[PDB]
UniProtKB/Swiss-Prot annotation, chain A:
The modification Phosphoserine is found at S31, S58. The gene is HINT1. The modification N6-acetyllysine is found at K7, K16. It comes from Homo sapiens (Human). Changing C70R: In NMAN; negligible protein expression due to post-translational degradation; no effect on homodimerization; no effect on adenosine 5'-monophosphoramidase; no effect on affinity for tryptamine adenosine phosphoramidate; loss of SUMO-specific isopeptidase activity. This is Adenosine 5'-monophosphoramidase HINT1. Coiled coil: none annotated. Its main location: cytoplasm. InterPro entries: Histidine_triad_CS (IPR019808), Histidine_triad_HIT (IPR001310), HIT-like (IPR011146), HIT-like_sf (IPR036265). One of its GO terms (biological process) is signal transduction.
Length: 112, 116
């Protein structure tokens, strides 16, 4: 089923967009957990990483490459953390695959 | 220059130091973390040495995606039916301690927010 991230992709509700191409979108998280906290999402509706297909491998890697390029452009020269949540134990909040990128502060261990 | 490099992860790739290996293919290796932060905590690493995600090349996209696909398949094979968290750390603020790219996969308990 549709999600709020689908609405963001379709431009039906606002988001602070950092980068877009034909296959993904990066935008600042509405509930940031670090001075910089953004998401990179595919335009294809994959509901969760556990259901991603083998043919999705390059697309998933593209999310990470876009994420690292956006992080550099946003000035995260001291580093950052990338996160994908799956399911209830993973704390996944929206059932549309999304890569979190967080930085601008020391990230701690354990990662939640 | 041995394939995989001489970080501990390169040594693990070449079977020069022991590891508890879950899965291995021509591109990557999954093995259990020695300092687990959850009841299940493993790492997926490429066999190609890339020091950190910030220096990955555009042509590394398929490999990076493969780490995630292998991570999710291993998580299912290990019975993480209630979910899990995948983490890549970059540099000092990310807490990266080994400069060979690695994907953490953690599960078997409720993970909390923020993720560190
Ligand atoms: N010999 C080893 N075998 C398996 N895992 C290891 C080993 N040495 C370090 N690690 C893990 O490799 C990870 C390095 N991950 S970080 O680079 O992201 N550093 C930390 O957050 C700590 C850490 O989680 C370490 O526990």
């Amino acid at each position: 089923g549709d999600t709020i991230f689908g609405k963001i992709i379709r431009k039906e509700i606002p988001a602070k967009i950092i980068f877009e191409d034909d296959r993904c979108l990066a935008f600042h998280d509405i509930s940031p957990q670090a001075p910089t906290h953004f998401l990179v999402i595919p335009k294809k509706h994959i509901s969760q990483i556990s259901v991603a297909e083998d043919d999705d491998e390059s697309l998933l890697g593209h999310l990470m490459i876009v994420g690292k390029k956006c992080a550099a452009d946003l000035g995260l020269n001291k580093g950052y953390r990338m996160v994908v949540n799956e399911g209830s134990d993973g704390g996944q909040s929206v059932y549309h695959v999304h890569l979190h990128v967080l930085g601008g502060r020391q990230m701690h261990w354990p990662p939640g």
